[PDB]
Amino acid sequence: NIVLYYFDARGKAELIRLIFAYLGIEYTDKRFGVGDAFVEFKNFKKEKDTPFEQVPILQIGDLILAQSQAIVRYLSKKYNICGESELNEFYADMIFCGVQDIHYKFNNTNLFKQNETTFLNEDLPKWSGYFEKLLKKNHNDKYYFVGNNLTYADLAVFNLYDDIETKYPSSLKNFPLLKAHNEFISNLPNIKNYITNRKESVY
């Protein structure tokens, strides 16, 4: 039995949820605070043998899995969406690591208030440019960052801009390949239904 534990938010769990949706995998989506999230989280840590007292936690039977990035890589490798060669697996990894750099900057701004000006004027346009150039290098209909098949890097980049656009909607106007890519991912047979019918608000 597969259980995902996180707060009632998208945040560090949403890419995992997107991956489960894409892969057609059955799981329980357990969210703290759907009463008191604070008390529930305290109870959770005492009940479960957590390595770092953080969520997301993925529990597969009696297996406890922690660290969102490790979980992402574990699933993508298991279900063949990590790239279809050793180098492509690297490139997928490199792109996901890049997503993490800019996502961290967005999180600090969106969540923990650090003024948005720097992010919006300096970080976001510059990083959008990096991703645009990476897509151009590999560029249907279909838009992949790595090879000629969907990788978790595609889902990661999709999730990044989906998260950013919840707070800042007009972020992709100047980046046509990136816009197209994110449109492509959102309309994938297994993604479309999940994204449109998941409860709003995360972070």
Ligand X SMILES: [NH3+][C@@H](CCC(=O)N[C@@H](CSCc1ccc(Br)cc1)C(=O)NCC(=O)O)C(=O)O
Interacting residue with ligand X among 56, 76, 95, 160 (CB under 6 A) = 56
Does 68 appear as a known binding residue? yes
Q: Is there a contact between 103 and 161 (Cβ–Cβ < 8 Å)?
A: no
What is each CA distance from 135 to 17, 99, 139, 152, 182, in whole angstroms? Answer: 24, 14, 6, 15, 11
Question: How many Å apart are CA 187 and CA 196, to the nearest integer?
Answer: 10
Q: Total number of residues binding ligand X (CB under 6 A)?
A: 15
Q: Rounded to the nearest whole angstrom, what is the least distance from the CB of residue 146 to ligand X in the complex?
A: 18
The structure tokens 């590999």 sit at 138
Q: Is 59 in the site for ligand X (CB under 6 A)?
A: no
Question: How many Å apart are CA 61 and CA 85, to the nearest integer?
Answer: 31
Q: Is 168 in the site for a second copy (CB under 8 A)?
A: no
Interstrand relation of 2-7 and 28-32 (parallel, antiparallel or unpaired): parallel
- Contacting range for ligand X; rule: CB under 6 A; set: 62-70, 124-132, 175-183, 189-197: 62-70
Q: Is 180 in the site for a second copy (CB under 8 A)?
A: no
Which phi and psi angles does 60 have, rounded to 5°?
-115, 105
37 binds, among a second copy, ligand X, none (CB under 5 to 8 A by kind): none
Does 54 appear as a known binding residue? yes
Q: Is 47 in the site for a second copy (CB under 8 A)?
A: no
Q: Total number of residues binding a second copy (CB under 8 A)?
A: 31
Which phi and psi angles does 175 have, rounded to 5°?
-130, 80
Which phi and psi angles does 57 have, rounded to 5°?
-120, 130
Count the neighbouring beta carbons within 10 Å of the beta carbon of residue 200.
Answer: 6
- Contacting range for a second copy; rule: CB under 8 A; set: 35-43, 128-136, 158-166, 183-191: 128-136
Q: Is 101 in the site for ligand X (CB under 6 A)?
A: yes
The structure tokens 């892969």 sit at 23
Residues flagged as binding site for glutathione: 54-55, 67-68, 101, 113, 117
Residues that bind ligand X (CB under 6 A): 7, 11-12, 53-56, 67-69, 97, 101, 107, 111, 203
Residues that bind a second copy (CB under 8 A): 51-54, 63, 65-70, 73-74, 77-78, 86-87, 89-90, 93-98, 101, 126-127, 130, 133-134
